[PDB]
Amino acid sequence: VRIKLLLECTECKRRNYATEKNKRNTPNKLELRKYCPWCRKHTVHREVKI
Amino acid sequence: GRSTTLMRLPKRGMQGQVPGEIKRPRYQGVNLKDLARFEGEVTPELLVRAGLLKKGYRLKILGEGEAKPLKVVAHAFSKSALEKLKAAGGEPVLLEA
Amino acid sequence: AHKKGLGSTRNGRDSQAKRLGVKRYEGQVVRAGNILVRQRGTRFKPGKNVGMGRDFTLFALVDGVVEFQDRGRLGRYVHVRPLA
Amino acid sequence: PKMKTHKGAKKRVKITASGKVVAMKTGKRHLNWQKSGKEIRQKGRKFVLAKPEAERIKLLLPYE
RNA sequence: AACCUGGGGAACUGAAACAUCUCAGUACCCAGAGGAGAGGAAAGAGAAAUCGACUCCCUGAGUAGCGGCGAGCGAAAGGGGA
RNA sequence: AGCCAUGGGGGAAUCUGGGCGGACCACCGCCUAAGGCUAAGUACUCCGGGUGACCGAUAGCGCACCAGUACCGUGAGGGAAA
RNA sequence: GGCGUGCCUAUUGAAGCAUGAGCCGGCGACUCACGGUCGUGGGCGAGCUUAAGCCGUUGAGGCGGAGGCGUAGGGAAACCGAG
RNA sequence: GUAAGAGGAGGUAUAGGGAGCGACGCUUGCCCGGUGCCGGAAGGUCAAGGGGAGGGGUGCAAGCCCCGAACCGAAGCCCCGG
RNA sequence: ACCGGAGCGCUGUCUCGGCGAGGGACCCGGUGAAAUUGAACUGGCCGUGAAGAUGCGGCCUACCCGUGGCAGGACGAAAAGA
RNA sequence: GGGCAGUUUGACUGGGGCGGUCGCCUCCUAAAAGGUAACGGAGGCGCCCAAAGGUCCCCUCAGGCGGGACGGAAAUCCGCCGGAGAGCGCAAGGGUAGAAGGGGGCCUGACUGCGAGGCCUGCAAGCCGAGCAGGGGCGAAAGCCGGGCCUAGUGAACCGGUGGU
Known part of the structure; x- marks a missing residue:
C-alpha cells in the first residue's frame, strides 16, 4: 500500500538507477542514500518520481 | 490454452517502419584461405562468376588462410587480413582514383 | 426426493508441497554449486567447506567428499572434505 | 502455395x-x-530447446 | 458457354469464443464493350549524373510491409525473356 | 503516413510556372498534369480438326439408343431410364 | 457322444433384453498441387542446379546461368570479424 | 418507399392516429423518492468550429509547415418545477 | 355447442347380462399388400450375466406339422428417446 | 438512440438451479524421501521496515516462591529457583538463546559487470548460490555486507508513458 510510495533512486551524473521505496507516513523526506550505479563506485543516488 | 510459448518478447530493433528498408551498402565477408586457393588476382569479375560473392557489393577480406604474392581487389580490409597482405599481397581500396 | 438441510466448508484449500530434504549423502561429490539440503530450520548445520544461503540450505564450495557429524550438544552437522 | 514464414x-x-x-x-x-x-543482469538474455525444434520448424523457408 | 472493363456487394469460415481483421471486393445483381479487350507514351521509375509507353512469362521473395503486432494477410524496383 | 482517386467546403498560376523523391523546411535530381487513339505478345473455350502409360452402358458429359424426352410440382426449377 | 455365449461397431466391460444389418450382383473412402523436413538411391564436388523461354521434334531431344542452394558467423543495429 | 410520390384525405380536431378496460347501474384512496413524459432566457460539463499568448524544425534571410493557451460556443445528461 | 353443485321424469351407465339381427371374420372360388427382417433346428424353474435368457449352467414338459382364438415375453414395431 | 442488426452469455457440481470457488503459504489425511485424489480436516495471504538493513561492543527469557506505596491473579523492582514452554512484524510449521532475541556507536551491500553448479519441473517460470573484477561501510584484526530466521507479500508477452543512449 501507498503512503510508502515507491521510487527509482535516480543518480546525478546524468542517470544510472537503483530502485527502492519511500515512507511518507514516516518523517522521511526525499532521500539521497549512498548507492552504486551501473557505472562507477558508491557515489551518490537521490530520489525521483514514482 | 496459453499462447504458443509466445510468452517470448520481441526486440527486433528497426523491424522496418513502412516506406521500405534502408537502401544500404551490404557486404561480403570472406577468408584468405579462399585467397590461398587461387594465385594471381582476385578482382570482382573473377570471384563473382566463380568463387562466392554473387552480385553483392562490398567485399571484406578476412579470416585465416595463407599469405601469397598475389593481387586482391576489394572495398574494405580487416586489420587481421591486412596483415596477411604484409607477409605477401596487395591492398586496393574503393577502386577509383 | 426431499433432501433436508445441508452445509458447506472452507477446508478445501491445501498448500503446495515443495520438494524438501537433503540432496546428497556421505560419498557423493559436489562441485561448488551442487546444493545438498532443502531444509527448514537447522536440522543439519554447515561446517568445513560447506556454505548455507538464504533459505537455510547447505551447499557446495569445493570439489568435496560428503560426510556427517553427530554433535548433540549443538545438534547435527554436515561437513565436506575434498582432497587435501 | 509457398508456406508463409510466421512473421511473428x-x-x-x-x-x-x-x-x-x-x-x-x-x-x-x-x-x-x-x-x-x-534479477537485472540475469534478465539480460535467455536459452531454450526441445519444443523449439517445432519452433525451429515454424521459422521455416529462410530457416534463420 | 468461357474470357472482359467498370457500376453495387454479401454470409458461412479462420482466429479453436468473437466485433478490429479474414473469407474477398470473392461468389452474386446490373450494364456495356470486342476478338480480344482492358490498358497505354511519363507531374514516370528511383540513387547512380540509372533506365525510358502498354499488356505477358520468369526470378526478385512469402521478400519489403501489415495486424486484439493473434489468426493471418501480403506487394514494387532490379534483372533473365515475350 | 506518403501517391493516386473524390463527396463537401475554402479555391492558383502559366516555366524561379507545377507535382514527386513517404509528415514537413533547406540542398540536389525526376518529369510537364488536369482532353484524346494504338496493333503485338496476355485471357478464355459455343466451335473445326488433332492427340492420350483417358472410360467402356452403375463407368463415361446429365444425355452411347428421339435427353433436356419421361415424369415431379401451378411455379422457379428437379431430373431418370434404356 | 466329449467340446462351443454369432459378426461389426461401441465400450473399464457384451449372448446381451445397446446397434448397423433379409438375402446377393455391382459403386464406394488416406490421392495430389506448392513448400518444408528426415532418411534414401545416384551425377557432383567447394561446388550444385537453371526458371520463363528458344532451337528442334511428330512420343526426339539439346540450348538457354537470371536466380535459389554452399563456404562466417557474432550484435536487434551501426557494424566487429573467427572472433 | 433510398426516393419520386403515395395512402390518410377531393378528410379538417364532434376529424384522423395510439394505448388502455370492454354493456349498462354504483366507484376510483396513498407517493415525484426512481424512471419516463412534460415545462424552463440561471448555473455545470461537453463535439466540430473561432481564436491566437507561448513553442518547435529549418534556411544567412524573406519565409513554408506543424504543436498550440485564455475566452466564446448548442443538442444532450445534471439543475428548478409540474 | 363455456366449468361446478342439486332435485324431478327416463334409460342397459351400472347389478348381470341373455336372445336375436345384417355386416366383417370362418369354408370354398378369382386376385393379392405392408412395416420388421443376421441367422435360426426358437418351451420351463433355480440361479447366472454390465443388473430383465429358448441360447450359460444344475436342471424341467413334451412325436412332426399345422388351424381358430387370447394377448404375457422376445427389454415389442413406430425415433439415430418429444 | 432495443425500432432494428450482430455477437458475448466461463468453468463448478455424487443428474442441474442457489451459495461457494479458481493464485500462494502453514500443517494433517501421506501408508518413515518424494509424492498423491475428496462439497475429506483446521487455517492464513495480496501488506511490511531508512530501520524492522547493515559491522562491531554488550546483556538474556517465560515463568516459580518469598517481598513491597498506588497497583495489587498482571503493573514495577529485589532476592533466589528457572537451560529455552519467552521473544523472534502479520498463518502455522519448523528452527532458535554457543541468537536469529533486547540496547548502542559509525554508517547505508533492498551495490556494478558476472556467474561455477545444483533443487525443481513438460514447457515457461520459480530457486540456493562458491568464487571473480570495481568500489565502499564496519571492526585493531580474523572477517562480515548482492536486504530482514525462514516457508505467501505475485502477473509472460505484446499496446503505451516518463527520464535517458
Whole structure:
C-alpha cells in the first residue's frame, strides 16, 4: 500500500538507477542514500518520481 | 490454452517502419584461405562468376588462410587480413582514383 | 426426493508441497554449486567447506567428499572434505 | 502455395545457425522496484530447446 | 458457354469464443464493350549524373510491409525473356 | 503516413510556372498534369480438326439408343431410364 | 457322444433384453498441387542446379546461368570479424 | 418507399392516429423518492468550429509547415418545477 | 355447442347380462399388400450375466406339422428417446 | 438512440438451479524421501521496515516462591529457583538463546559487470548460490555486507508513458 510510495533512486551524473521505496507516513523526506550505479563506485543516488 | 510459448518478447530493433528498408551498402565477408586457393588476382569479375560473392557489393577480406604474392581487389580490409597482405599481397581500396 | 438441510466448508484449500530434504549423502561429490539440503530450520548445520544461503540450505564450495557429524550438544552437522 | 514464414516469432527470436533455438528472457517489464540487480543482469538474455525444434520448424523457408 | 472493363456487394469460415481483421471486393445483381479487350507514351521509375509507353512469362521473395503486432494477410524496383 | 482517386467546403498560376523523391523546411535530381487513339505478345473455350502409360452402358458429359424426352410440382426449377 | 455365449461397431466391460444389418450382383473412402523436413538411391564436388523461354521434334531431344542452394558467423543495429 | 410520390384525405380536431378496460347501474384512496413524459432566457460539463499568448524544425534571410493557451460556443445528461 | 353443485321424469351407465339381427371374420372360388427382417433346428424353474435368457449352467414338459382364438415375453414395431 | 442488426452469455457440481470457488503459504489425511485424489480436516495471504538493513561492543527469557506505596491473579523492582514452554512484524510449521532475541556507536551491500553448479519441473517460470573484477561501510584484526530466521507479500508477452543512449 501507498503512503510508502515507491521510487527509482535516480543518480546525478546524468542517470544510472537503483530502485527502492519511500515512507511518507514516516518523517522521511526525499532521500539521497549512498548507492552504486551501473557505472562507477558508491557515489551518490537521490530520489525521483514514482 | 496459453499462447504458443509466445510468452517470448520481441526486440527486433528497426523491424522496418513502412516506406521500405534502408537502401544500404551490404557486404561480403570472406577468408584468405579462399585467397590461398587461387594465385594471381582476385578482382570482382573473377570471384563473382566463380568463387562466392554473387552480385553483392562490398567485399571484406578476412579470416585465416595463407599469405601469397598475389593481387586482391576489394572495398574494405580487416586489420587481421591486412596483415596477411604484409607477409605477401596487395591492398586496393574503393577502386577509383 | 426431499433432501433436508445441508452445509458447506472452507477446508478445501491445501498448500503446495515443495520438494524438501537433503540432496546428497556421505560419498557423493559436489562441485561448488551442487546444493545438498532443502531444509527448514537447522536440522543439519554447515561446517568445513560447506556454505548455507538464504533459505537455510547447505551447499557446495569445493570439489568435496560428503560426510556427517553427530554433535548433540549443538545438534547435527554436515561437513565436506575434498582432497587435501 | 509457398508456406508463409510466421512473421511473428521471426520478428522475435534467435537460433544459432547450427540449429539451437535460443530466445529472450521475460518477466522483465513492470517489476524492477523492490527487485535487485541480480534479477537485472540475469534478465539480460535467455536459452531454450526441445519444443523449439517445432519452433525451429515454424521459422521455416529462410530457416534463420 | 468461357474470357472482359467498370457500376453495387454479401454470409458461412479462420482466429479453436468473437466485433478490429479474414473469407474477398470473392461468389452474386446490373450494364456495356470486342476478338480480344482492358490498358497505354511519363507531374514516370528511383540513387547512380540509372533506365525510358502498354499488356505477358520468369526470378526478385512469402521478400519489403501489415495486424486484439493473434489468426493471418501480403506487394514494387532490379534483372533473365515475350 | 506518403501517391493516386473524390463527396463537401475554402479555391492558383502559366516555366524561379507545377507535382514527386513517404509528415514537413533547406540542398540536389525526376518529369510537364488536369482532353484524346494504338496493333503485338496476355485471357478464355459455343466451335473445326488433332492427340492420350483417358472410360467402356452403375463407368463415361446429365444425355452411347428421339435427353433436356419421361415424369415431379401451378411455379422457379428437379431430373431418370434404356 | 466329449467340446462351443454369432459378426461389426461401441465400450473399464457384451449372448446381451445397446446397434448397423433379409438375402446377393455391382459403386464406394488416406490421392495430389506448392513448400518444408528426415532418411534414401545416384551425377557432383567447394561446388550444385537453371526458371520463363528458344532451337528442334511428330512420343526426339539439346540450348538457354537470371536466380535459389554452399563456404562466417557474432550484435536487434551501426557494424566487429573467427572472433 | 433510398426516393419520386403515395395512402390518410377531393378528410379538417364532434376529424384522423395510439394505448388502455370492454354493456349498462354504483366507484376510483396513498407517493415525484426512481424512471419516463412534460415545462424552463440561471448555473455545470461537453463535439466540430473561432481564436491566437507561448513553442518547435529549418534556411544567412524573406519565409513554408506543424504543436498550440485564455475566452466564446448548442443538442444532450445534471439543475428548478409540474 | 363455456366449468361446478342439486332435485324431478327416463334409460342397459351400472347389478348381470341373455336372445336375436345384417355386416366383417370362418369354408370354398378369382386376385393379392405392408412395416420388421443376421441367422435360426426358437418351451420351463433355480440361479447366472454390465443388473430383465429358448441360447450359460444344475436342471424341467413334451412325436412332426399345422388351424381358430387370447394377448404375457422376445427389454415389442413406430425415433439415430418429444 | 432495443425500432432494428450482430455477437458475448466461463468453468463448478455424487443428474442441474442457489451459495461457494479458481493464485500462494502453514500443517494433517501421506501408508518413515518424494509424492498423491475428496462439497475429506483446521487455517492464513495480496501488506511490511531508512530501520524492522547493515559491522562491531554488550546483556538474556517465560515463568516459580518469598517481598513491597498506588497497583495489587498482571503493573514495577529485589532476592533466589528457572537451560529455552519467552521473544523472534502479520498463518502455522519448523528452527532458535554457543541468537536469529533486547540496547548502542559509525554508517547505508533492498551495490556494478558476472556467474561455477545444483533443487525443481513438460514447457515457461520459480530457486540456493562458491568464487571473480570495481568500489565502499564496519571492526585493531580474523572477517562480515548482492536486504530482514525462514516457508505467501505475485502477473509472460505484446499496446503505451516518463527520464535517458
